[PDB]
Amino acid sequence: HWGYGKHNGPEHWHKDFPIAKGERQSPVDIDTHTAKYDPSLKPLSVSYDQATSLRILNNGHAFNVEFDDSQDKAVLKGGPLDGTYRLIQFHFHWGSLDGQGSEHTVDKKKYAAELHLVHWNTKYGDFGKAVQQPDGLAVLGIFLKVGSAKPGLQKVVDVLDSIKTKGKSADFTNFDPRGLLPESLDYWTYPGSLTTPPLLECVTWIVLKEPISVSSEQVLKFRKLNFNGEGEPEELMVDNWRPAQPLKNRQIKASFK
Ligand SMILES: NS(=O)(=O)c1cc(F)ccc1F
Numbered sequence: 001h002w003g004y005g006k007h008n009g010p011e012h013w014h015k016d017f018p019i020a021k022g023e024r025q026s027p028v029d030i031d032t033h034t035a036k037y038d039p040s041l042k043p044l045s046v047s048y049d050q051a052t053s054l055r056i057l058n059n060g061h062a063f064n065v066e067f068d069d070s071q072d073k074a075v076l077k078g079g080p081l082d083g084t085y086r087l088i089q090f091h092f093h094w095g096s097l098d099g100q101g102s103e104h105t106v107d108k109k110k111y112a113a114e115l116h117l118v119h120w121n122t123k124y125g126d127f128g129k130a131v132q133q134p135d136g137l138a139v140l141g142i143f144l145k146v147g148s149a150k151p152g153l154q155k156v157v158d159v160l161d162s163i164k165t166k167g168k169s170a171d172f173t174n175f176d177p178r179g180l181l182p183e184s185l186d187y188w189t190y191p192g193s194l195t196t197p198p199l200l201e202c203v204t205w206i207v208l209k210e211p212i213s214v215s216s217e218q219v220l221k222f223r224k225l226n227f228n229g230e231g232e233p234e235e236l237m238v239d240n241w242r243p244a245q246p247l248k249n250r251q252i253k254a255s256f257k
């Protein structure tokens, strides 16, 4: 039911998901001047060398690249995190034009897109239990700006023609998500939520400071996807981002001095 349009988008979600107006909603604007270095953060560990990708799915809202999370392969640890968080999927949010598309903003600046690598805390056994816990999930967020092509993204771009419409999927084995990272792991972190319904307040957000560059041609192919199913009137999959939400009683901490 929910979506991104005038009649079912972010301003309507609260009617079926009242937590939309909650105390730790995401995304937020990251005021870089107010964010404070936190010496209590431990080194961040992104351990993706044994990742096992499986499938890419157009879910009608974005596309998800899904991973085998049946044991610790790709995991995120350290930083603000207590315990091991297993990678389950990644997806993006993007705009109709380069000047918008990110969910988080940096001193109010919107990036062209934002990558979310989604992980669940293994002490809760399964994703469904994890989303009943305040520390159930960790999402690693990475901004995309338009410039040079990102070679590690091209395999994703080139399969999108095969999943144009809602409900289509394709095999997507042997994809290495390490090729989507920037050089630096400097980050900001804060407690928040899922950015789509059901908007559950379970997420430790870790948002990298350094964007990745992707080419205009790469993001233009994201914008050829469809929200609609096969045979239905074409609705381009663009502007699938939620705007920044009130920070409320939170502080954004920085990993860097
Ligand atoms: N609250 S909502 O965005 O899920 C929503 C769903 C509908 F089917 C119709 C209107 C809506 F506002």
Ligand SMILES: NS(=O)(=O)c1cc(F)ccc1F
Binding pocket: 116, 118, 139, 193, 194, 195, 196, 197, 198
């Ligand atoms: N955009 S998000 O990373 O907060 C997210 C991840 C999920 F697994 C489910 C819903 C979401 F909204």
Ligand SMILES: OC[C@H]1O[C@@H](O)[C@H](O)[C@@H](O)[C@@H]1O
Binding pocket: 049, 050, 051, 052, 173, 174, 175, 176
């Ligand atoms: O095929 C993508 C990646 O899959 C992983 O499981 C392997 O360990 C990596 O060496 C490889 O780059």
Ligand SMILES: OC[C@H]1O[C@@H](O)[C@H](O)[C@@H](O)[C@@H]1O
Binding pocket: 036, 251
């Ligand atoms: O009371 C002082 C403390 O205030 C908190 O809001 C800050 O997060 C801490 O960094 C600071 O030491």
Ligand SMILES: OC[C@H]1O[C@H](O)[C@H](O)[C@@H](O)[C@@H]1O
Binding pocket: 155, 159, 171, 172, 173, 174, 175, 176
């Ligand atoms: O790595 C993800 C995918 O990249 C390319 O599409 C390959 O042709 C395919 O075999 C692989 O599954």
Ligand SMILES: [Zn+2]
Binding pocket: 091, 092, 093, 116, 195
């Ligand atoms: Zn997301």
